[PDB]
Design a protein around this ligand. Sequence first.
Ligand code: CHL
Ligand code: CLA
Ligand code: CLA
Ligand code: CLA
Ligand SMILES: CC1=C[C@H](O)CC(C)(C)[C@H]1/C=C/C(C)=C/C=C/C(C)=C/C=C/C=C(C)/C=C/C=C(C)/C=C/C1=C(C)C[C@H](O)CC1(C)C
Lengths: 126, 222, 39, 193, 163
Amino acid sequence: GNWLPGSDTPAYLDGLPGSFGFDPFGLGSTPANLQRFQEAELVHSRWAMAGAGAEAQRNAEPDAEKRKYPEENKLKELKNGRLAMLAFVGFIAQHAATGKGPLEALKLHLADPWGANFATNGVSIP
Amino acid sequence: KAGNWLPGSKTPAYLEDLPGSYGFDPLKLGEDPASLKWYVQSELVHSRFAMAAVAGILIPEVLKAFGAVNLPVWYEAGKYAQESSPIPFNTLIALEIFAFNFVEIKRWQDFKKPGSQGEEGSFVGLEGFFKGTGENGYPGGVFDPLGLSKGPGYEAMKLREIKNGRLAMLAFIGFASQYLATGKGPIENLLDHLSNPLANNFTTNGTSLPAQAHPLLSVLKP
Amino acid sequence: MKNFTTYLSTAPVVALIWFTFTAGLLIEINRFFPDPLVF
Amino acid sequence: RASWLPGSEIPSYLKGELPGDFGFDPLRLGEDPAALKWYQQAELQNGRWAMLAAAGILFVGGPAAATPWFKASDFTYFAPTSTLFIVELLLFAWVEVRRYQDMVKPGSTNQDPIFSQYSLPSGNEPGYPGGIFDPLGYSELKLKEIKNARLAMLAVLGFFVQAKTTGKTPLDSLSSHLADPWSNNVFGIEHAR
Amino acid sequence: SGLTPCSESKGFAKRQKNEIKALTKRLKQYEEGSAPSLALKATIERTEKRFANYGNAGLLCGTDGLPHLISDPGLALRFGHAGETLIPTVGFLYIAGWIGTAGRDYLIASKGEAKPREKEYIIDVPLALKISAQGAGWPFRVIRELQKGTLLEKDSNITVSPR
Ligand code: CHL
Ligand code: CLA
Ligand code: CLA
Ligand code: CLA
Ligand SMILES: CC1=C[C@H](O)CC(C)(C)[C@H]1/C=C/C(C)=C/C=C/C(C)=C/C=C/C=C(C)/C=C/C=C(C)/C=C/C1=C(C)C[C@H](O)CC1(C)C
């Protein structure tokens, strides 16, 4: 649907897979940038889910869809991948902010949801 | 026009439609249109710098007066931050020179050719950030993330920005002059004025009216 | 009065007034701030 | 037409369209229609939060309910003071972006995001929603709301100023004024510094 | 340059002492409270203040015991001598550009009159005072004329002798 229900989504975003109409700053307003950033989102999401010669052959073909997908499962991949990149950035930020691993901090949140979070530790809020 | 800076005077015609205009140009600096465009940008840039600076001075000082925080005073905050700064002084200057050279050249290029930093191939794929609005001094894009320039209060917000900007510019120069004249911070200066306004002002700081130029000060006293 | 003010606007009268003002200003600066060598 | 000052001139942009319209704008604050609409919504918002605040301040046994309202933050809860601030910020962020998006484009936020069959009825005003916000069909009533909202705003301001100068609870201030009114009021108390 | 600060120069101190001694020798021929005595004492006070002020300004002194000025902008800024020549350079150039711009503005304004030569020896004093006040903003206007191309007359419009 819509990232902001009531906001008017741009016309270039409609029809794309995984399009919730989110482009406030209009970076995909041109087709050349929109096609390349579609590849970048898919590659970032695929690397986040799992976390020279291979990357060179990725862009050797002159096609458009083969650089991205070499309709329901595409949206399924895009909604799962974005959560994976959010999760990895959360892992980096939490290990930078508490000094602990990503799994033991889940147990610390479970054992104290109201006294141990990003608000309490003196890194995320000075 | 927002008004007349001097009621009854003849206001210049080239300032009739500018936001924040009171017809104030007695030195005729903005009579040339290209100069006027450059000075509009310069006034906005000075306004926004002073705005942020006066915020970063006054809000810590207000919260220090309220007992909330105890951050260092503004004229000594450079020393205290530099000792604890992981980055040394020279590297900080070099980084600031590089970053501001880049961003000010981008702003300058947009001033000379409007919308030219948002064209296709201008930036490295991220040119949609910097499309501009076709208005001198109002970039938008990343700089207007909430999109409030597209609302109906945009023209009144331009006027609010300029008048608050001029007030902040005067306020920062007042901060600097008050420190040079009294040696104390701005909230202490305000409290001293509030305790005795007749005796605690610039006429008694020993600097603003030099004693040699004003011999009546040493004479007309109890 | 118009003819008299036109005479007062002739070049030597204006020169006299302006140079009296400038010389007086310099003299009074040096009276109030004696012996200025440096800024 | 009822007015705050009978016999005076009324501003031309206040014709009783709005509830509580008594022609009271001495400083001519809301003149352009965007300003007047924003100040209408802001009056509704400030008045409703002030009604809740006046109720929650006048209502306060129990060790917690014996503390002053201006010293209420020092009571011990199950969470540190930082945690509740951010949780309240998050919940308020969600409901406020919903209300703001309604304010910009009316009727835009009327549908439950997870239930497509549950939707607020159309014709919704910005400051006057419907549906689950009016479980009873109670809807003359807008004049009552705006009057109680303004009285609560003045009452909450009185709470703030009375706790700042005298340093007393509202009930203590009322009891001090009810002891001797001619000496315990704003005159004399402030004149004794 | 191998100089010494005047506040630690022995020649500077000797000069102050000698000048005060000469003025004091002149003093012991007048009664106290007389006009010559008061005038000489005022001169002595001014001499003492002058030597103190020149020592306190960080001026450098030569082997002559006299202050020597530093005028290289690099040496002045790094060693605290900008008040000797550099800041006076800025002040002079500002006033001189003011005077020149006011004169140019008055001449240009007089060029459009029906009798342009009349304003050159019978001064339009209100116009001259107005133009003189506007000379404070001369660098901005002059720089704009330079970039616009209106500061200079074109070479094809200026008379020249046969070559
Ligand atoms: C607006 C900029 C600015 C101003 C007004 C000041 C003012 C001050 N600082 Mg700070 N600083 C400033 C920026 C910066 N300072 C510092 C780092 C420090 C330290 C570490 C210390 C100070 C201290 C001081 C005080 C000492 C007085 C002095 O040395 O004069 C400096 C006078 C100035 C006017 C600042 C420098 C000139 C100019 C404003 C710089 C910016 C101009 C642009 C770069 C020009 C660019 C040209 C364009 C067109 C290409 C003084 C109140 C110290 C002090 O209080 O001692 C106890 C102290 O210890 N400052 C950095 C990090 C590199 C800055 C970055 O911009
Ligand atoms: C932003 C505007 C502003 C405000 C509100 C103040 C306020 C104050 N100043 Mg600062 N100041 C300012 C700008 C300001 N100043 C500027 C631009 C300078 C450089 C000229 C100074 C230089 C200065 C010195 C050297 C001293 C003060 C002092 C004071 C105190 C008042 C007594 C006095 O001597 O007045 C200052 C007199 C002036 C002629 C400066 C006036 C400049 C402003 C811009 C005039 C416009 C005012 C505006 C029309 C109305 C203001 C309303 C307000 C709500 C903004 C008071 C705390 C004294 C002190 O620190 O405490 C005892 C003192 O010794 N000021
Ligand atoms: C660097 C700051 C700066 C700049 C670039 C401008 C530029 C502009 N001003 Mg603004 N202004 C400022 C600061 C500035 N102003 C401050 C602090 C105030 C409040 C006092 C104002 C109050 C003001 C009014 C009321 C109006 C303008 C107007 C204008 C515009 C046309 C006049 C012109 O061409 O001036 C060009 C200016 C410069 C090239 C800068 C000259 C700098 C010199 C060196 C100043 C030195 C003298 C000064 C007295 C020293 C300050 C001391 C003081 C702090 C105590 C132009 C956009 C008019 C306009 O129409 O609205 C948009 C108008 O009506 N200004
Ligand atoms: C409007 C006044 C004005 C202006 C802008 C100039 C500008 C110039 N002069 Mg010309 N000059 C003037 C008046 C002026 N002069 C007068 C009245 C005389 C007769 C004494 C001269 C005699 C003259 C000579 C002999 C030379 C110049 C040269 C120059 C050039 C280099 C600067 C210089 O050498 O200054 C030096 C200026 C003088 C020695 C005389 C200045 C006299 C005063 C200070 C200026 C006049 C002020 C005016 C009366 C103000 C009235 C305005 C008021 C009514 C509003 C420059 C083009 C030189 C050259 O051509 O360079 C390439 C050169 O060799 N000038
Ligand atoms: C779209 C747009 C729109 C508008 O226009 C604007 C804006 C808003 C700006 C935008 C938005 C956005 C977003 C937010 C971005 C961000 C993102 C992501 C997060 C990235 C990633 C990121 C993520 C990804 C890369 C990833 C990576 C991962 C990796 C592999 C990992 C690795 C690891 C693992 C294996 C394990 C081992 O043992 C180790 C290691 C090795 C360590």
